[PDB]
């Protein structure tokens, strides 16, 4: 007993995996673990989630990418699909939910065929051809090619889908505010950059009272007065607001008596002259991230100048873009052309928090900010994450075009079409394509499970009503009627590009994970 | 410790020093109490003094 | 020897579903019980000591929850709501927590039924919106009315908010001080202006409101006791720059051949300081304050020429002073002129409890005052300060918004009646949730009466019966131990407090109930 043999001692302590056993069972099981992990995630009936990191920080979340980011995972192909979805989020926004569900379904149905003995490589071929066919057929499903550039109503109606998805209670407010954000931002640095929107979190005064400013905000103090001029003249300085100290170790030296008197006096006088020259161009407000000399702020108070402090490089960049005035590393030249211009700037109190406001009106275009108000900062994290995902959604919309009918309806059409192409495939891969087509039922399935209605006959009725070309009809959200709803009238849409990309990435993740057969694992 | 007929206390410092006194403020100040309301009374006497 | 590959880290705790949710509800209830006793005109406060041994008593629930460092996740949300309400409107943070916990408590039996949480939160959102609208409808202004002084509402608001904290029997006094003080705060409205001064000793009935600025601080230099310490009608000079012999000014090496030149160098340094002092005197002021330390020699000169001075004054109090006497802080002694020179009705510095304080007050145009807060307990200092902070910020909100509602839970009872009646209209699962909403909401009077040791069932029953028809503002009266029109009894709280309370509690319930499982990482 107690002593079997090893024909290979090659490893100093490590995991050798082989024999397709890991691919057939263990890897698939890990993927299904993830699938169950965030099956509840997606859905308007999907309910939120909380997780604490390894460093004990709360994360209330409904987004899948964020929650995957907070689970430090070890099975490799688990990481595969995780980071696949992660990059997908980096590309489109929501769909992390989508792609993870796709991966789970495709893996689960593929292992069944593998058990029924289909060639792994042939499974690869079938899945690839099915994905390509689905890509081919997808554009034929676009409806409501919403084209209005800068209207509020169309974009509000559209962004309602994502906001509703990741927050079911407050569609109207968030829709209107984010739409106000989108219309307020024009193409200035190129086609509605996501980075052009900033988010601030301010606790208290629950969500309904959250508002949006056409300017940009700061949670910092002030040094002199608090004033706004309808013609506010802003000066920006990356350099610290002080006499320019030589980088070289420059020790001031004296030789005779009067040097001390004259040196201190001249320092005073030339700081006075510098700040006066700044005031001469009429600039009433100055901002800098560098250190502020007390002498400088004193003279500024003498000349009724506003000061803003401790800004980080990104912050001053934002402000630069807001007022369109060029930051000046040289303290001297308050040049007229590159000098600030804002509707109004002042200091206000919200939530016992000193707040610097750049309240603005800009026809040429400005990078606006949204103000978030409410009790729980964790809810702020969730809601701002959802808002940013919606902003990404609007950006992707702007990328090209072509809303598609959500609510699974699109995916039911995909299933039907792919299956129909399946029986015209024939070859042993027919099972592969048939199972791939079957896999899309996961989405409506997930919506059902988070909806808590009997999924099977829901899917059946959905199929039946989809046998008449009603490509716009999808899964309802109603306990009274656990049957059906017509998506187009309900306005429950989503983007072509998002679905297309999610499908392709899920396909790539699947083809990668299925492909590997034996594993090697050094000890961590 | 109260009254001309009263009797005073003698304290032992942490560092082994000694002190004889009748002033209640000092009595409680030098005390090493742990129960909180004892601390509250100590601070009481300090404030009153 | 292969092994199964884990999904997450070893010991990664997980707990999913109805047990998880009910555990969270129970945790919220536990948090409630730590604060349940607290609120009430006969309410309660707690004492919590840290691991460091520093005691801390508190009646404001938010402070207590801050002290009770919560580890369980769900309760952290409740404590965060405590911070939110504390930053927003004041007492009732207590009440906020009780509302949250009781909402969860009433819902939990239905959670035992496998109801999808989203139905519950939808009902909650609808109910809360309707409740807020009802409150705003039954809000009461006074500037429409005739028998209101622009302060009487504020005075009664302080009257109401105060009479739960540690100073309850001095409310008739402290309300007058705080209202008159905040009246001076206009129009900056920010708390940093009026400081709070926790002077040791004395009975808090002796606590002082000064129409000016005082210091709990000074520092002994050579002559500080020599100079006269009365200045009847003085001029205030405010220096940020230090006054000392190149103590911490620019660092420089110097080279000098002729000995006489070295003599001249030391003479010139002292001539620097003398020049600064001459600028100070010839300014005509007599009182000088400095953030930075003061040279002893300059103190000597002020003493000889009967100017008062002081050094190292904390910056915040200096800002208070300059805003008070109207002068502007200076860093260049040379640019000095009479314009930036603050003036005060009278200056003094008088002992209080062994400490050496400084006084200057009576400035007719001074938008900032300060509280000298006598009190025999160091713990009273923090507790009274917290209560006063609540008072100040709530009265600020009141000035901002001329909206008042009755106290004593009467608002909550009215909402209960209104919501219950509305529930009849909507059939189905929503009706039960609305009913539970009302049944949770009624808690406030119950806790009040329990801390009052009454049969709150008789009180509640009479309350509902009388409050179906007879008048809006009937509610609990502690001393008469039964219902009264607390509005006429002047139990007046700003609407904003209850409105924000309800909104926060609603979204708290939404958040908590919107959780199915929890993941822990070592």
UniProtKB/Swiss-Prot annotation, chain A:
There is a cross-link at residues 219, 249, 255 (Glycyl lysine isopeptide (Lys-Gly) (interchain with G-Cter in SUMO2)). Keywords: Acetylation, ATP-binding, Cell projection, Chaperone, Cilium, Cytoplasm, Cytoskeleton, Hydrolase, Isopeptide bond, Nucleotide-binding, Phosphoprotein, Ubl conjugation. GO terms for biological process: binding of sperm to zona pellucida; chaperone mediated protein folding independent of cofactor; chaperone-mediated protein folding; positive regulation of protein localization to Cajal body; positive regulation of telomerase RNA localization to Cajal body; positive regulation of telomere maintenance via telomerase; protein folding; protein stabilization. The modification Phosphoserine is found at residues 18, 157, 208, 264, 312. There is a cross-link at residue 454 (Glycyl lysine isopeptide (Lys-Gly) (interchain with G-Cter in SUMO1)). ATP binds at residues 95-97, 165-166, 407, 494, 499. Gene3D superfamilies: GroEL (3.50.7.10), GroEL-like equatorial domain (1.10.560.10), TCP-1-like chaperonin intermediate domain (3.30.260.10). It catalyses: ATP + H2O = ADP + phosphate + H(+). Pfam families: Cpn60_TCP1 (PF00118). ADP binds at residues 42-43, 95-98, 164-166, 407, 494. InterPro entries: Chap_CCT_theta, Chaperone_TCP-1, Chaperonin_TCP-1_CS, Cpn60/GroEL/TCP-1, GroEL-like_apical_dom_sf, GROEL-like_equatorial_sf, TCP-1-like_intermed_sf. The modification N6-acetyllysine is found at residues 313, 395, 461. It is found in: Cytoplasm; Cytoplasm, Cytoskeleton, Microtubule organizing center, Centrosome; Cytoplasm, Cytoskeleton, Cilium basal body. Its EC number is 3.6.1.-. GO terms for cellular component: azurophil granule lumen; cell body; centrosome; chaperonin-containing T-complex; cilium; cytoplasm; cytosol; extracellular exosome. Mg(2+) binds at residue 94. It is linked to De novo genetic variants in nearly every subunit of the TRiC complex, including CCT8, have been found in individuals with a broad spectrum of brain malformations, and clinical phenotypes ranging from mild to severe epilepsy, developmental delay, intellectual disability, ataxia, and other features of cerebral malfunction. NCBIfam families: chap_CCT_theta (TIGR02346). PANTHER family: CHAPERONIN. Belongs to the TCP-1 chaperonin family. This is T-complex protein 1 subunit theta. It comes from Homo sapiens. The gene is CCT8.
Curated annotation (Swiss-Prot), chain B:
It is found in: Cytoplasm; Cytoplasm, Cytoskeleton, Microtubule organizing center, Centrosome. ADP binds at residue 3. Transmembrane segments: none annotated. Induction: Down-regulated in response to enterovirus 71 (EV71) infection (at protein level). ATP binds at residue 3. Ubiquitinated by the DCX(DCAF12) complex specifically recognizes the diglutamate (Glu-Glu) at the C-terminus, leading to its degradation. Component of the chaperonin-containing T-complex (TRiC), a hexadecamer composed of two identical back-to-back stacked rings enclosing a protein folding chamber. Each ring is made up of eight different subunits: TCP1/CCT1, CCT2, CCT3, CCT4, CCT5, CCT6A/CCT6, CCT7, CCT8. Interacts with PACRG. Interacts with DNAAF4. Interacts with DLEC1. Interacts with SPMAP2. Belongs to the TCP-1 chaperonin family. It is linked to Neuropathy, hereditary sensory, with spastic paraplegia, autosomal recessive: A disease characterized by spastic paraplegia and progressive distal sensory neuropathy leading to mutilating ulcerations of the upper and lower limbs. De novo genetic variants in nearly every subunit of the TRiC complex, including CCT5, have been found in individuals with a broad spectrum of brain malformations, and clinical phenotypes ranging from mild to severe epilepsy, developmental delay, intellectual disability, ataxia, and other features of cerebral malfunction. This is T-complex protein 1 subunit epsilon. It comes from Homo sapiens (Human). The gene is CCT5. The chain holds residues 51 to 99 of 541 of the full protein.
From Swiss-Prot, chain C:
ADP binds at residues 40, 92-95, 163-164, 408, 493, 498. It catalyses: ATP + H2O = ADP + phosphate + H(+). It is an enzyme of class 3 (hydrolase). Changing residue 378 to K: Found in a patient with developmental delay, intellectual disability, pyramidal and cerebellar signs, cerebellar vermis hypoplasia and hypoplasia of the corpus callosum; uncertain significance. One of its GO terms (biological process) is protein stabilization. The modification N6-acetyllysine is found at residues 66, 249, 319. It is found in: Cytoplasm. GO terms for cellular component: cell body; chaperonin-containing T-complex; cytoplasm; cytosol; extracellular exosome; microtubule. Keywords: Acetylation, ATP-binding, Chaperone, Cytoplasm, Hydrolase, Isopeptide bond, Methylation, Nucleotide-binding, Ubl conjugation. Its EC number is 3.6.1.-. Disulfide bonds: none annotated. GO terms for molecular function: ATP binding; ATP hydrolysis activity; ATP-dependent protein folding chaperone; identical protein binding; protein folding chaperone; unfolded protein binding. Mg(2+) binds at residue 91. Its main location: cytoplasm. ATP binds at residues 40, 92, 95, 397, 408, 498. Component of the chaperonin-containing T-complex (TRiC), a molecular chaperone complex that assists the folding of actin, tubulin and other proteins upon ATP hydrolysis. The TRiC complex mediates the folding of WRAP53/TCAB1, thereby regulating telomere maintenance. Belongs to the TCP-1 chaperonin family. Component of the chaperonin-containing T-complex (TRiC), a hexadecamer composed of two identical back-to-back stacked rings enclosing a protein folding chamber. Each ring is made up of eight different subunits: TCP1/CCT1, CCT2, CCT3, CCT4, CCT5, CCT6A/CCT6, CCT7, CCT8. Interacts with PACRG. Interacts with DLEC1. This is T-complex protein 1 subunit eta. It comes from Homo sapiens. The gene is CCT7.
